[PDB]
Amino acid sequence: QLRSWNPPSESVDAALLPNFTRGNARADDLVRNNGYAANAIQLHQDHIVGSFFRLSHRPSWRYLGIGEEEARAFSREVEAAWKEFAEDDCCCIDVERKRTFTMMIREGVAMHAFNGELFVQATWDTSSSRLFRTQFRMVSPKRISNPNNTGDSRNCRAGVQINDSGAALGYYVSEDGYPGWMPQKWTWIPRELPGGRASFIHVFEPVEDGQTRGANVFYSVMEQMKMLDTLQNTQLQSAIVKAMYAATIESELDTQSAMDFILGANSQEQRERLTGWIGEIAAYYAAAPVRLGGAKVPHLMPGDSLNLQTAQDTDNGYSVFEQSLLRYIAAGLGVSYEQLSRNYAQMSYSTARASANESWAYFMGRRKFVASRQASQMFLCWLEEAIVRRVVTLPSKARFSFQEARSAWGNCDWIGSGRMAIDGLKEVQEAVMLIEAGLSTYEKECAKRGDDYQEIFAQQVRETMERRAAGLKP
Amino acid sequence: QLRSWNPPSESVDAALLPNFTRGNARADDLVRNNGYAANAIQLHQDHIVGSFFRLSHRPSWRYLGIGEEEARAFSREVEAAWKEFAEDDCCCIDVERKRTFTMMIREGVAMHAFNGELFVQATWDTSSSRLFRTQFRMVSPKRISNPNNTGDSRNCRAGVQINDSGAALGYYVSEDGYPGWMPQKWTWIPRELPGGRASFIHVFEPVEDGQTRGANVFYSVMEQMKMLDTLQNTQLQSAIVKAMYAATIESELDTQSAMDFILGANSQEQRERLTGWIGEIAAYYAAAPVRLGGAKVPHLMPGDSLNLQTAQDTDNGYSVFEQSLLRYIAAGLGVSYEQLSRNYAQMSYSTARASANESWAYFMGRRKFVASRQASQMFLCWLEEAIVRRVVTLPSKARFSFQEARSAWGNCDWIGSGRMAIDGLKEVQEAVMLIEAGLSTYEKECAKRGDDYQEIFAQQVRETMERRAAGLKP
Amino acid sequence: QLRSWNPPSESVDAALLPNFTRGNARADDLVRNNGYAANAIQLHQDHIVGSFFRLSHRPSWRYLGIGEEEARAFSREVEAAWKEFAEDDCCCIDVERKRTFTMMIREGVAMHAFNGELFVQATWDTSSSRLFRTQFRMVSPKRISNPNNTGDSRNCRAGVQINDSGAALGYYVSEDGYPGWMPQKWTWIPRELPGGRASFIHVFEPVEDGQTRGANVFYSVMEQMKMLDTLQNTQLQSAIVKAMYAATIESELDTQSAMDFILGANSQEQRERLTGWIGEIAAYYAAAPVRLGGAKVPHLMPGDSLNLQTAQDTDNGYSVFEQSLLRYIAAGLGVSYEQLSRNYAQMSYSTARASANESWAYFMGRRKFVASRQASQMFLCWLEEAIVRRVVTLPSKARFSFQEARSAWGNCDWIGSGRMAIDGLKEVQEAVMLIEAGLSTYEKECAKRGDDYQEIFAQQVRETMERRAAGLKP
Amino acid sequence: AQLLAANEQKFKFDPLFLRLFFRESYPFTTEKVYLSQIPGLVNMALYVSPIVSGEVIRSRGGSTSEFTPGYVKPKHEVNPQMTLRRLPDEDPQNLADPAYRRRRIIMQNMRDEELAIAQVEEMQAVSAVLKGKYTMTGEAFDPVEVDMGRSEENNITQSGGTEWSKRDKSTYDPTDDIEAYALNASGVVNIIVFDPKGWALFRSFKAVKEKLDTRRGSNSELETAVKDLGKAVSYKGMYGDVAIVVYSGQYVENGVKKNFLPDNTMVLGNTQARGLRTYGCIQDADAQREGINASARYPKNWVTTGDPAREFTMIQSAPLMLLADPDEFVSVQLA
């Protein structure tokens, strides 16, 4: 079985890139034919981004000498601008003109999960319906190959032109293949502009040094493919052969030496004996009507029957095989099957909350690992455009210029899915302890709750004043 | 078995579009013959929209410089207008004149679930029974094919005319096929008007770039089809063969060499022996009446019987096969079977509330992903019409014009199904904690409760004053 | 087995309408022969309407400029009038003169459940026993066929005359067939009058566009039919063959060659041997009295016996087959069998209240989906008649005329079954939390409780004053 | 079944015929060779008056433009049941791998394949420049004679008149015959490559042996070519003006082996004679739908499902290599 799937013995990058197309193609096959990939990407979406992905700008006020109040007001301005620019209802923020920021993050994270890499391009849109002429078009991974599909070279390696030190200079984007009859032409695309401008945002997780591509799926999913095939076929055979039945006719006849002599005489010159016996047996079956049930017994003149003696008859064991292996690959691939297909077998209280909190912290890990890159890159490009357009005003006491301290000025964090609910009592006792001991700040409280302290305080002011005015109890 | 269903190895869009008609047709077959699709669409309806889908208009007052109080009063006016326009009792808001806003959302979400896409068209009704001359007619997905059913082309691709960059310009709507004998003629329909007017609302979820169609169902449901078939047939065979019985007659007779010699002599020239024996056996069965029960033993003269020796006799295993696979595809397709067909097997407390809260948050995900598009599009069209008719008054200090900031002015959110009830104690301890710590605002409190803070306060005023007047206890 | 039931591969409307009569006829067969349909319709009745269906008129006072107090008093007048008109004790509100409003809703919902559609007609009764000359006669679905049972046509489609756009103009009502010998004649009936008057209330749920008929039952119930048949027959066979017994007589005799020679000699010319042996065996059985029990051993002279060797002897499996399938179709069709036939197997506390609350919310869904249409239509017709008769007085400051704003004036909601009881502690802790936090209004409190705030306050006034007068404790 | 790109050899070692005289490759998208389509030699003299310019010049319509290329498509099995060629002690553990055994055995199989087509192409070349006739033939195929047009003076024989065997082994000089046969060759001859015994009786004359220079005196890249193909081309040395070579290449036919060269033959001509390598259509659905209908060679590795449920390596080609000028070489049978 190791024949149809073969690992070379070498560093992972040189063991994957030669068989990149086959592994990725069979990955496409399984993610299309199989529901597990859809469920996994959907849960990753709903744990990492969830409803939305919220920007929070925190310029390094302490290091830059900027006042915290000026930083906070400038952040208010940039947050209002960014939310109003992102909430465009006409899907107009993409060059394809059919994806908002939500689906920017969606397709980016999905493709960085599947192929391990995502490709964003900051292009200059001309549609004047918005103040900001920068859109972000996502680039397929099929596009990145060496110019004219040539094999890897000295410095042109699977489509990326690098130096001897590996520094990613640029890329050869092959032309799109949709419809299925466009030819591919390779075009030069630099990774970033010299001034720090993020033109081609290439975010991938390298497992080792010098690696150019991300992680796969199929190269650990062939075994589900062939287990589902084998369980499927074995259930089919079991079902079809629980009551397969042979309906033949035998007789006494069979006078050993006499039967053999009759057969030999028929073979030599006395076939009339066989013809007469066949006629008698045909008359037998047409005067009997030899019929078993609703159907006719298949015509068998005496002396021939099937021997449907069977193989071993122990239990198939597939039960504990499949539970063990589903277990196995479930906290292999990472998301547990007791919800990837939802068993409720013997699961208990500590079971539930321990599994939930470890899995949720681990999704927080993946979120902070493979979402903040895209978030910061897009925010940096948008903030550069805003500074170009003088939408928001930089602090006058800027210790470093915007172009010099884009990292310092464009320092930001992002908020993923909403408020976690698992037990209730858990979150509420945590909340009461934090609010009584002061062990929670504005920033981490809002991180835990998916809200904002400024708005909760303003709305509590509104709550109290409306209760006082209408006669309610604050 | 892989013969009657075949995946190509290619990108998903080019692997689905060539076999679009067959997959969709067998999807129709299974959603019509099978109850699971009906239950799934019904639960999706009752989790996403539920009773109703409530509009809430929040123009970006902070960014536009609009006062929050003016924004709130303008929102009050637009909400009153929208509710009174939507509550039309004569089903008159559609061109078909037989669906209200509720069934707009219903059919839209159902078709965007089945085919992955929904097609709305903003048409100018002439029926003067309402102030607003805009209706929204939904367009079938069968209509979108290339002009005269031609195969995909360079830029005309499965009915959508796009550019090289993929931008969806317009569509070729084939003529309706009901009654089953109208010919199809393809008509041009642009996606949107240049001024931002949403004429042809085409909302679909693209799994990858350049994809034009949504997701399927059958391409993961063929296995339920053939498992239900195999379990059905195997139960039928098991039932019919638990007591199938062969009723033949044998005798001692059978003098080996003598019987063979008699048969050979009969075959050659002595058939009178066989005739005499048959006569004797007929007299035997007519003087015995050889009868077993209520029925006659089927006529078998001696020397011939059926050999109903069986196949293996181990348990079929279908029990744990079917539990494992129902498990499997249940949190595949997404909604758990312990309610898609309702098992109560060994299910526990943490089981219940963990499963319920994760599934409900995930339905909140689907709701915010595939309902807000249609909601915002319809609201934008209706608000544009209202501004045309001067029903509601835009703020005088508009920083941007309506046509320029339709996204900013027409910023809105929507509320789906009503107040979730699962445990009681859970929701009430959450409510008491939120109302004591102030950790809940007007907007998210009303989101959690399915109510409105303004109306709860006004009705609490009414409550207190009526209790005071009538003598009750506020 | 797929032979006696056949799905075409096409859109659901064109896959059902050609086989409409057969599917509906077998649906009638199963709903008549089978108790499940009766139980399901009874529970749907008792969950949707229950005891009664209560009208509540809420004209859009805010949008129309009407004062809330005037709207409430006008609603009081219309509610008193509607309750006194509906409470007619002589069953006189129907043209058939044998159904009140309760059975209007009953038959309407039952037929909209069975066929997916209901047909009401607003006719002008002449019986002067009531002030209102409008009755509502319900129209059978068998009546709607093309004029003279012709097949579907261009615009005349299964009895409905529509345009190319599908707009339902009118209907061809075939004459009644009771007694079973009236001929059918097709009469024209428009769907609604141009002035918005609801003449022919045709309420059906269309699964897709252009669909004219509702949903079925049998097309998912054939499998219960044939499972009940197969389990029935297999239990009958098992019962009859647990102790079927063959009572024959064999003997030693059987001297192989000698017996064969004797039989051959008898066949040729020596039948006297057989006659003598038969005489000896008859004397044997008449001198023995060969008798086994209370009955005589059936007469078998030696040398012939039945071979009742059996088929396989594994457990039938029907146990877990039937539990799995009852499970299956139970939360298929929607109402769980652990009450459609009431199992109490291993069912637990979270089991009970989770299942109950989800099922009850889902019945609230069906109620608000398939009851409010009929309620609003009937209320609109009755209110139009009341305005014609000047029973209730419209507001003088009417921003729009009655005929123009029938939807705005005739805005109404309805209350179904009474106060839900499942646990007690649940409802009471909910009630105490709502009444302490004010999180419940008049309208939704009365919706939850099945009462009225005005009457509860008036009766609490009466309670307190009678307790004070008689000496009790308020 | 492995991909198309697993066709890396870097082993092009044809015996100085298809690489030195017959460089002029013309793979077509069309079945036959259309010599009218090939420009070949261009009409290459006339100018126009210093007022205006003249007509349009075309490919000058070759008289015969219809011959059948030798569409050769053999195959083999690479069934992982053999122990393979084990290069000395490079970790036979990878041979123990079915993956490495299968890939280097498809390497070995396919290299056998192109050297097979190369050796049959060399037989075509030796027929071509030894008689001007080529036998496009095979069972279940009509024998087409493809003639470049070798003239009679290009087929004049040494045995006619006086034979070198029937001459003085000491005083006679065959150089006179050398220019006698070289004059009617439409050019200069600079290689005198013999078959072995032909060179034997050539050098049997003393005048030859004290006229030839055994020294290198490296004239051209022919020494480099001999160093490359030290197998069957043997650079005897200088005969002074001209280079002396001997070809003793051998083809190993169905049951036996024998030399490419006949007993005693010679072709007098240049090292830069023009040789056409017209190539026909490649009848493989893969080749057509990926555009390899006009190419040199096509490999593939592919699995048969069913009766011959196995896996094979398939090589397809269609050469019809000829010589542009058959008169360029004088073909002489020797004494």
UniProtKB/Swiss-Prot annotation, chains A, B, C:
Location in or out of the cell: Virion
Predominant subcellular localization, coarse grouping: virion
Family affiliation: Belongs to the siphoviridae portal protein family.
GO cellular component: viral portal complex
Annotated organism of origin: Escherichia phage lambda (Bacteriophage lambda)
One example of a Gene Ontology biological process annotation: virion assembly
Keywords: Capsid protein, DNA-binding, Viral capsid assembly, Viral genome ejection through host cell envelope, Viral genome packaging, Viral long flexible tail ejection system, Viral penetration into host cytoplasm, Viral release from host cell, Virion, Virus entry into host cell
Post-translational note: Proteolytically cleaved by the viral protease during capsid maturation.
Function summary: Forms the portal vertex of the capsid. This portal plays critical roles in head assembly, genome packaging, neck/tail attachment, and genome ejection. The portal protein multimerizes as a single ring-shaped homododecamer arranged around a central channel. Binds to the terminase subunits to form the packaging machine.
Name of the protein in its database record: Portal protein B
Known partners and oligomeric status: Homododecamer. Interacts with the terminase complex composed of two small and one large terminase subunits.
InterPro entries registered for this protein in UniProt: Phage_lambda_portal
Keyword DNA-binding in record: yes
NCBIfam families linked to this entry: portal_lambda (TIGR01539)
Curated annotation (Swiss-Prot), chain D:
Keyword hit for Hydrolase: no
Protein location: Virion; Host cytoplasm
Domain of life: Viruses
Cystine connections: none
Alphabetic keyword roster: Capsid protein, Host cytoplasm, Late protein, T=7 icosahedral capsid protein, Virion
Oligomer and partners: Homomultimer. Interacts with FI protein.
Protein role: Assembles to form an icosahedral capsid with a T=7 symmetry. The icosahedral capsid is about 60 nm in diameter and composed of 415 major capsid proteins. The assembly is primed by the interaction between capsid assembly protease and portal dodecamer, and major capsid proteins assemble cooperatively to form the procapsid with the help of capsid scaffolding protein. Major capsid protein forms hexons and pentons of the icosahedron. Viral genomic DNA is packaged into the procapsid through the portal vertex.
Family: Belongs to the lambda phage major capsid protein family.
Protein name, per record: Major capsid protein
Organism: Escherichia phage lambda (Bacteriophage lambda)
